[PDB]
Predict the structure of Eight-heme nitrite reductase.
Amino acid sequence: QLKPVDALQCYDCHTQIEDMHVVGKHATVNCVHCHDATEHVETASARRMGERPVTHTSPEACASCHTAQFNSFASVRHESHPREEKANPRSRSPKFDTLIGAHGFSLEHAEPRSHAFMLVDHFIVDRAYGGRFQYKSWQNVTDGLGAVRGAWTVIEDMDPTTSDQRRFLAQTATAANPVCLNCKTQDHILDWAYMGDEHDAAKWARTSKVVDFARDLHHPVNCYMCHDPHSTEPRVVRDALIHAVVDQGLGTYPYDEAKSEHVTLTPVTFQRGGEDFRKIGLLNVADSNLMCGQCHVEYNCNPGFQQSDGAPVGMDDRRTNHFFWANVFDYAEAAKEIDFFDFTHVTTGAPLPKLQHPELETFWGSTHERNGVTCADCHMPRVKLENGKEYTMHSPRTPRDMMNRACLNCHDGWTEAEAEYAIDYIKNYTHGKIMKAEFWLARMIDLFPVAKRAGVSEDVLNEVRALHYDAHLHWEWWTAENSVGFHNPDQARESLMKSITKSKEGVGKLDAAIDAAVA
Amino acid sequence: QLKPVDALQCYDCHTQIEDMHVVGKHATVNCVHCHDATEHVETASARRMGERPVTHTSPEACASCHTAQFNSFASVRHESHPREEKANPRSRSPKFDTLIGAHGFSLEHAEPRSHAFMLVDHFIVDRAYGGRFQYKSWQNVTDGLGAVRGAWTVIEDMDPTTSDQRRFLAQTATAANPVCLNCKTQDHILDWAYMGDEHDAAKWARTSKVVDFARDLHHPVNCYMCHDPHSTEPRVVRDALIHAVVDQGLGTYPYDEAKSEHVTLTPVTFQRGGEDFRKIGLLNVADSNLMCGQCHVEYNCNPGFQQSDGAPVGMDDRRTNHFFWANVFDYAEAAKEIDFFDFTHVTTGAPLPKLQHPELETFWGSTHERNGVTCADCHMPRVKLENGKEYTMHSPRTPRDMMNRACLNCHDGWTEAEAEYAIDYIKNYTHGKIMKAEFWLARMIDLFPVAKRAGVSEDVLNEVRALHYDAHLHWEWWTAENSVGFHNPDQARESLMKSITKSKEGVGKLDAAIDAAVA
Ligand code: HEC
Ligand code: HEC
Ligand code: HEC
Ligand code: HEC
Ligand code: HEC
Ligand code: HEC
Ligand code: HEC
Ligand code: HEC
Ligand code: HEC
Ligand code: HEC
Ligand code: HEC
Ligand code: HEC
Ligand code: HEC
Ligand code: HEC
Ligand SMILES: O=S([O-])[O-]
Ligand SMILES: O=S([O-])[O-]
Ligand SMILES: [Ca+2]
Ligand SMILES: [Ca+2]
Ligand SMILES: [Co+2]
Ligand SMILES: [Co+2]
Ligand SMILES: [Co+2]
Ligand SMILES: [Co+2]
């Protein structure tokens, strides 16, 4: 090889970048590391892009100076069970098939594994692209580094000649859409307007042909999702998160006004031909809660339906790219606010929300969050070295693998066995309430066809359908959320007991109605 | 089983015991645990003992209520190399046979092993009783609990019919005498007057037939050596220690007057027929430096000779039970204060001191000692229990076995590997200097016969004999001291460098004199 460009020349038309670049810890880092802009420079004016310069979005673009963080970022935790289906007695949600009915998640919902695989896994999961995309080889499942280097080096398209979403295997679904990708990659960061709105400068939008968009995307969880590449400063880039914090007025910590003042997101808008195009959110502190909260939150990234009239809410509507940014007890109200539900249960006919990994919103208010602990403290701490610069690890994983750093540094009276035991006590307890919430909800769901077939009245079914909304929300939050209660045990406990209460109620109401109908 | 005695009835005559017993943590502990005094009570007067009560001196007498401490006390560290001779390229003093000459230690000087064996190893070492006492079987070498229960359960006497010290094997010596036993056992605590003086009330004294004494003795390092059995309070019982510290006013920390004020021995004297018989030294705090310094010090416990006139100093003289109570740099002067040396080197003719394990006097003034660390902090810490009362371990051993407790609790920036490495750095460095001090001293010694045979003058010989005393002292201190410099690395270094300097001077004078003599 690389030959530096004259950055001062760049600054002549890129004051917004200069202001970020010259002030930060990348002041000495030349644009050529991340951009090829020779023809751009030859052809541009301050008012005309000329040739579009290339922006290198590979995490490997950072590995020439930050190999340690890159290597950690690419690493694979073999102990994290790969491709393990949750609808399964060995996993999170043994009754998930009954509970979720014909939702796309019924086609496959595996447990999470290492970050390196996130784009790949998104592409190949059975629910996403109808089986269109597949590992080139079952051997490829191990290759975290190959995945980081580019999805398409390890997976393949069954039919590169067509772009339509269809099933290639009988038990697959085509739930993927362009919004999904925002939590898998930011390769498209310069090609996607804020919120995924259609925009003249945006190749890709909420309404794009997701198969064509998929083909343009390569790298998982880009290094620049958390670090501004020009200033180095901590940031978020995820549109829905900025929208929640800023546009919705909710603040960084919606349940703590002081903390929302202590931890700040400063939006920065970049323009195209003078029009607002894309945004980022500069953090005043490297708050991993927000960094991780770009993805580990409950969201819409899918069409749905309006609670008011059942009208479809398709990808063209911003509500299909939305963070609720709310705890489990506020979720129903948040969803009601945007007049939105995900799906109608196939058996019971109840409009339902569909819950996805609400780790941040669960973590809010927990003792750990109340005390200033962030996701990275337990999942992504600094390495420990007798004689080394102690950099931050970059592939988040269970604190079980690093108990001294993750727990024992703070809990200095405990042994590693005790700390793990405290984890398991909570997880076990919660999992037991999940099993009971599933038992009861499944009972209620199973009673629906009996009720309908015995001629139970719409009024009664409609009451149960209402209960089903809260029973479902207050169960699924917990199979969706991946800490099995650890992140907020009192909350998991209250919520799951609520789900069970609702479900028992619906069962009693169904039973009474069936017995009456039959009498 | 045991029936409690009427303590009050004892207290009528035993007023000092009452004072100690009723006020401490053994107030509820009946005399019958440690004494069988029925015939005594029936026969005693205010002044005559009458029938002698039995005192149970086994550590096992404490085990009924202090099992944890007893079990730890009896435990055996297998990794402490057993019966390993120091005069050995694999051990402390490869040139020891040259350096110590005809001294008794030349018959055997093994490295220390676990406390449980101390009395047995004293009885059976080749230098002690002419090989009279032997393990009943080589199998018995592992039996630490057996040894604690009584030496004579695991060892035997080659000739119970005679009491004279003589060799039963060709390469043994009969170095033992009754003073030795004070650092192996206190079974004889009621049978030995303070200092081992001949005394009407003492069955055993400095001048006793040691073989007869030996047969009267059973247990190692009795629990009551450090704990008063009546009050439970920390104490010492070793006469020569109390003599140094209290009688001679040298203080518990003779190099630190302020510390000697803060750590104190309060003498308590017990009489027999109204004359002073035995003493203990009650500690104001449980300072294990003083507890351990009952044994881990440099001492006389052997006949020797006067520096002034060469006259023998036999067991009758109190100097044969003496704690020098001096660091390596003050030792020569302390030996002069008692006009004493141990042996004449068989080759050089030099009067020499014989140095034995001066761990405490080495420890004085070390960084750790200065910061109030004690022997037990590194060698006998509390056990660590997740869920138990954490008692003190009671078989002292290398901190290598228990680094978290011994080192890493105070040195929390260090890993176990780092703390060991620091240990090894000092031991290696020190060992290196001991090997060089050996090389030079041996070279000096070996030159003496060449000098003598060349006709070198007594004046030159005498001057090199004076050098030998210090060359020896500043060498042997360190093979005697079992930490290989760790206890005081800067002192070991200065002193070993002094030994070397003296030896090189000695060699230079002998070489010059031999050269002149031959020419
Ligand atoms: C004026 C003569 C320019 C100079 C000198 C440089 N750039 Fe530029 N650049 C310029 C314009 C008018 C635009 C378009 C802004 C808009 O309204 O859209 C750009 C764009 C970029 C981009 C983004 C391209 C994209 O994918 O949207 C990059 C990464 C970029 N420019 C980099 C860049 C570099 C590294 C330069 C020095 C080698 C440089 N530009 C000079 C105008 C001008
Ligand atoms: C890697 C460490 C980078 C270096 C060094 C430089 N740039 Fe950059 N740039 C980088 C990325 C990954 C992106 C995508 C957007 C994001 O925020 O991550 C960009 C973007 C730009 C743009 C477009 C900004 C916009 O209007 O949307 C421009 C104009 C730009 N970069 C210019 C630029 C210049 C001039 C640099 C040398 C001073 C430079 N970049 C260095 C990554 C990296
Ligand atoms: C060398 C040519 C680099 C490239 C390519 C990338 N980074 Fe960098 N980074 C570089 C330097 C010399 C420094 C300063 C280090 C220091 O000691 O001050 C940095 C710093 C960072 C930081 C942290 C700044 C801090 O707060 O300590 C980050 C987060 C960082 N760099 C990120 C990063 C990313 C994401 C990159 C790929 C887009 C990247 N760097 C490339 C040198 C270089
Ligand atoms: C979107 C770009 C994400 C960001 C930002 C963070 N995470 Fe993540 N995480 C994400 C996905 C899509 C997955 C599943 C990946 C797959 O292929 O299955 C994960 C997974 C995890 C895990 C589990 C890893 C394992 O060993 O199973 C953890 C512990 C995790 N994520 C935590 C985490 C932390 C602490 C983050 C901030 C530092 C973070 N994630 C950001 C998506 C994204
Ligand atoms: C950010 C708000 C995300 C959105 C948008 C999408 N996903 Fe996601 N995904 C996210 C996280 C934090 C995780 C790990 C936690 C968990 O429940 O696993 C995931 C995980 C996946 C996985 C791996 C596990 C699995 O379900 O098999 C896949 C295959 C996946 N996600 C696919 C997927 C699809 C198809 C999406 C659009 C409909 C989508 N994700 C969006 C974060 C986010
Ligand atoms: C959000 C999920 C992140 C992603 C994506 C990347 N990094 Fe990171 N990085 C993150 C955190 C929480 C931290 C620690 C910040 C703190 O002050 O506590 C870091 C730190 C760095 C650094 C600084 C040195 C260090 O502590 O290791 C560098 C140079 C860095 N990160 C680089 C980097 C690279 C190269 C990435 C892609 C491989 C990358 N980061 C992604 C959070 C996140
Ligand atoms: C320490 C108090 C933690 C905080 C801070 C965060 N998490 Fe956590 N998480 C924690 C535990 C003990 C567990 C269970 C892990 C185990 O081995 O049993 C988890 C689990 C997760 C997971 C699933 C990981 C896995 O099972 O391998 C994820 C995806 C996760 N946590 C994410 C996450 C987020 C996003 C956080 C900030 C909002 C966060 N965790 C903080 C402990 C702690
Ligand atoms: C007065 C009639 C006494 C009574 C009542 C008890 N004891 Fe005694 N004892 C007495 C004398 C005069 C002596 C000699 C020492 C002295 O204090 O002058 C002793 C000695 C002992 C000893 C030490 C024995 C030894 O081997 O040296 C012990 C252990 C002892 N006594 C115990 C003891 C007990 C337990 C008594 C109540 C059962 C008791 N004594 C009563 C005088 C008298
Ligand atoms: C073990 C826990 C004991 C208890 C209970 C009692 N005694 Fe004791 N005693 C014990 C030992 C090991 C010794 C030897 C000396 C020493 O200080 O360790 C003694 C000594 C005595 C003596 C002799 C004191 C002297 O003049 O030399 C007497 C008189 C004595 N003990 C009395 C005594 C009484 C009356 C007790 C019940 C109240 C008692 N002891 C309990 C061990 C233990
Ligand atoms: C039961 C009949 C016991 C006999 C035999 C021995 N000890 Fe004891 N000891 C006993 C009790 C009930 C207590 C008090 C426990 C408490 O903490 O309240 C003790 C205490 C001690 C102590 C500790 C004093 C302290 O400062 O904490 C010591 C050092 C002690 N005992 C020593 C000891 C010895 C050496 C024994 C054999 C001679 C012995 N004890 C026997 C109960 C009993
Ligand atoms: C206290 C001042 C002691 C006197 C009196 C005696 N010994 Fe000793 N001995 C003492 C300690 C602290 C140690 C461990 C340190 C060491 O140099 O090993 C020992 C060790 C022994 C051993 C075992 C190692 C060995 O030398 O083979 C034996 C066999 C031994 N001691 C015998 C012995 C003899 C024969 C004594 C009178 C001449 C004698 N010891 C006195 C402390 C003390
Ligand atoms: C000196 C070399 C000792 C020998 C001989 C015995 N013990 Fe001990 N003991 C010693 C120390 C340094 C300590 C810790 C004191 C402190 O305050 O830190 C102890 C402690 C005890 C206790 C108290 C409870 C505990 O800490 O474990 C008891 C009950 C005790 N020791 C009993 C005991 C027994 C039964 C012994 C013979 C088996 C014994 N001690 C010998 C030092 C020494
Ligand atoms: C005289 C009764 C002693 C008392 C009081 C203390 N120690 Fe000792 N120790 C003594 C001897 C005679 C020996 C040699 C034993 C043998 O048979 O060889 C020892 C040995 C040790 C050792 C070495 C243990 C090993 O595993 O090799 C250590 C570390 C030691 N001693 C330390 C020590 C401590 C800390 C003491 C006070 C708590 C202590 N000893 C007292 C003799 C005596
Ligand atoms: C911590 C700062 C210590 C203090 C306090 C005491 N000792 Fe020590 N000792 C220490 C070390 C690191 C070593 C070397 C052991 C090793 O494994 O390398 C020793 C050694 C001894 C030994 C020989 C033990 C053996 O090598 O197995 C003895 C007999 C000994 N130390 C005795 C002792 C005494 C009596 C103490 C108080 C005067 C004392 N030590 C304090 C570390 C420390
Ligand atoms: O599909 S993702 O949100 O788990
Ligand atoms: O001989 S003793 O002092 O080891
Ligand atoms: Ca959702
Ligand atoms: Ca000596
Ligand atoms: Co599993
Ligand atoms: Co999931
Ligand atoms: Co050895
Ligand atoms: Co020795």
